[PDB]
Amino acid sequence: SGFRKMAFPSGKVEGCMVQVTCGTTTLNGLWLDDVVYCPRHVICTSEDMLNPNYEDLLIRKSNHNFLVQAGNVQLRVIGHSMQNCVLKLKVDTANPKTPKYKFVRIQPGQTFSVLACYNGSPSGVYQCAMRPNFTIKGSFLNGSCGSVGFNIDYDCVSFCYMHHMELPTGVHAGTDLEGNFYGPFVDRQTAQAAGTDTTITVNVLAWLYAAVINGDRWFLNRFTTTLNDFNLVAMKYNYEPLTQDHVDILGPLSAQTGIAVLDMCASLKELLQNGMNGRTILGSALLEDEFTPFDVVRQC
Amino acid sequence: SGFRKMAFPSGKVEGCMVQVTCGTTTLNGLWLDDVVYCPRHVICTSEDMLNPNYEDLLIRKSNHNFLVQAGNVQLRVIGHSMQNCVLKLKVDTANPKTPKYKFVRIQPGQTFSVLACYNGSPSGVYQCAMRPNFTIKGSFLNGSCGSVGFNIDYDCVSFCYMHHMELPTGVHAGTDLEGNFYGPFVDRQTAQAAGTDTTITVNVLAWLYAAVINGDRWFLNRFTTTLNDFNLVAMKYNYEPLTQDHVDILGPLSAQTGIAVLDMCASLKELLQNGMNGRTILGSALLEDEFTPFDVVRQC
Ligand SMILES: O=C(c1cc(=O)[nH]c2ccccc12)N1CCN(c2ccc(Cl)c(Cl)c2)C[C@@H]1CN1CCOCC1
Ligand SMILES: O=C(c1cc(=O)[nH]c2ccccc12)N1CCN(c2ccc(Cl)c(Cl)c2)C[C@@H]1CN1CCOCC1
């Protein structure tokens, strides 16, 4: 029993982290086979920050302008190119530690593990969710750009996030590994800010089921509600609408606990309207929305 | 910015996990050089759980009774012995993936990373604290015994915990890697239960400093208190007493934020007496006590 924010073991990703230096700027790269992937703003000067033309900046570079270091070994770059907002540096040596991998883009409301790295050296691992507004509430300091987010299925690493920037509210924005930003953010200096966010309803419900599996039951009730009536309450509390497909996804959890989905929805409605009255659920005094149904089933 | 419960990268430990089978029981072991460490209750049968005499059960075993599997590769056991509540199985092959390591015992109130494992295969990593009652609030299922807890300093893994059992309240108990239990727990069938617990005061204060470093300031005040006046409030709320050494440990955080320790203590007294009135701190609606001052400095 117990329930923790649990990340995937990070070893397969640790073996892929390298350091990329261009000019006086250093950040992290992801070395898979003979390609190193990193954020293209590594080629930016302080000067060309308001409106950098990355095509211009890149044509003015040669392979020798990029220093890639895999631990103590220097990797010679033999090709360079841009794909959207990521740089691809072809190196003369295939990474012998390359796991099976895929580049997958995730949906708002899905979770992933983040390997925070500095100077090509992993420093910590934690679990994140993609917010509905396409930010992530990460933990990142100077030098963390190029850190990646991922999930592991069997032996296969699905890379889904590369870290690019921190927004004024202290949340984080980045791209998939094709270089395509999550959300309406760009790799240049603007007043860009996170948009309004909302609470991931299907995840809160998944986490209430986790609580029931772990013996917290004080919030349960005999009452039930309809899908339409629940969604009216969700909208009033800035919660995402619940779909029948969400209800379906919650089926296994509902069956394991014998608590109908709409029954758990009635409990969530009361929690939103009444608060906790000084109690906790799985060691939290608020409703947690960064565990998916899959996360709950995996850990519970 | 941001603040997450952050574990150490687990790769150095993933390379040490193996599967140990004795009879019909299988659990996890830790393979360092040519030794595999695992919980000795792997040699128990359902028959004698009440008062197992491990010296008797072990003398009745031979090397052939222990099956060790490192991934797809079987390891021949060439020796066996018991050290307190851990089994040491000498194998004919030194683990080529052995990191630099040390066996250290931690203090109540210290944190560590846990690599949850099943059948020798890592499944997830999360951060834990040793409770003042010497339990840990882990996340562990059937087959998780033998999972280890650790910290990493520079390149060196300090193993501090091996998982042995789950208590009736759903918390967890285990030993250091010398086989010595944390707390008054034994590897046999009793009605043993976690003793009364208390809140780790120095950690709560560290977490408030993390919040100030991260821009949460609503809880600060112009008031101050004495060390002795604070401790009287701490005792009322089942918080541990604060020492001058705790004040000294909090010095660097005090200096970075310009908030005297005893000033922050005054804020904590008010938070205890008044609650939070619907506000959050670092995304929590309760006072978090599983971040040490070191964890805060490392991440902030
Ligand atoms: O390494 C970090 C960094 C990442 C992070 O997640 N959090 C941090 C916290 C504290 C200091 C630095 C960081 N940085 C350097 C590169 N950078 C950048 C450079 C060019 C382009 Cl074009 C773009 Cl998009 C982004 C982002 C960031 C600097 N920003 C400035 C605004 O205030 C937040 C920090
Ligand atoms: O693999 C687990 C296991 C660990 C855990 O952390 N949580 C679990 C949750 C659910 C089911 C199993 C576990 N088990 C098998 C070995 N065992 C044991 C065997 C002999 C001795 Cl002598 C000792 Cl001390 C301990 C502990 C545990 C079984 N217990 C029974 C009581 O209820 C809690 C689980």
CA distance B134 to B195: 9
User: What whole-number distance in Å separates Cα of residue A268 and Cα of residue A225?
Assistant: 10
Handedness of CA B170, B176, B179, B180 (dihedral sign): negative
Q: Tell me the C-alpha to C-alpha distance, in Å, between residue A9 and each of A28, A279, B32, B172, B228.
A: 19, 33, 19, 21, 44
Other Cβ atoms less than 10 A from the Cβ of A73: the count is: 9
Strand, helix or coil at B7? strand
Tokens describing residue A198: 């909302």
Find the ligand nearest to A39 CA: 1
Obtained via which technique? Answer: X-ray
| Residues 6 or more apart in contact with residue A220 via CB below 8 angstroms | A212, A259, A263, A267
Fold of A11-91: Thrombin, subunit H (2.40.10)
Q: Whole-angstrom distance between the N-terminal and C-terminal Cα of chain B?
A: 7
Length of chain A: 300
3-state SS, one letter per residue, for chain A: CCCCCCECCCHHHHCCEEEEEECCEEEEEEEECCEEEEEHHHHCCCCCCCCCCHHHHHHCCCHHHEEEEECCEEECEEEEEEECCEEEEEECCCCCCCCEEEECCCCCCCEEEEEEEECCEEEEEEEEECCCCCCECCCCCCCCCCCEEEEEECCEEEEEEEEEEECCCCCEEEECCCCCECCCCCCCCCCCCCCCCCECHHHHHHHHHHHHHCCCCCCCCCCCCCHHHHHHHHHHCCECCCCHHHHHHCHHHHHHHCCCHHHHHHHHHHHHHHCCCCCCECCECCCCCCCCHHHHHHHC
Specify the DSSP element, H or E, that contains B24: none
Question: Do the first three CATH levels of B11-91 and B201-299 match, i.e. the same topology?
Answer: no
A260 contacts: CB under 8 Å, gap ≥ 6: A224, A254
- What does the alpha-carbon distance between residue A291 and residue B139 come to, in Å, rounded to a whole number? 14
Q: Yes or no: is domain A201-299 CATH 3.40.50.10860?
A: no
The DSSP element (H or E) to which B113 belongs, if any, is strand B111-118
Q: Between the CA of residue A293 and those of A4, A12, A110, B289, what are the distances in Å? A: 14, 25, 10, 28
Chain B residues with CB inside 8 Å of A124's CB? 6-9, 298-299
Task: Say whether residue A15 is in contact with chain B using an 8 A CB cutoff.
Answer: yes
Those of residues 150-189 in A touching chain B at CB distance below 8 A are 166, 170-172
Structure's resolution in angstroms: 1.8
**Strands B156-166 and A156-166, bridge-based pairing:** unpaired
* Residue pointed to by tokens 């999930």: A151
| Sheet containing strand A86-91, strands side by side | A73-75, A66-70, A17-22, A25-32, A35-39, A86-91, A77-83
Q: Could you tell me if residue B20 is left (phi over 0), alpha (psi between -120 and 50 degrees) or otherwise beta?
A: beta
Given the DSSP bridges, would you call strands B111-118 and B121-129 parallel, antiparallel or unpaired?
Answer: antiparallel
* Spatial distance between the Cα atoms of B162 and B173, rounded to a whole number of angstroms: 9
The token pair that represents A46 in the structure block: 């302080």
Q: Are B11 and A6 inside 8 Å of each other by CB?
A: no
Ligand 1 neighbour A175 (Cβ under 6 A): no
Distance of CA A80 to the CA centre of its chain: 27
Residue A295: both structure tokens together:
């996360």
Residue A88 touches partner B, C-beta closer than 8 Å: no
Assign B207 to helix, strand or coil.
Answer: helix
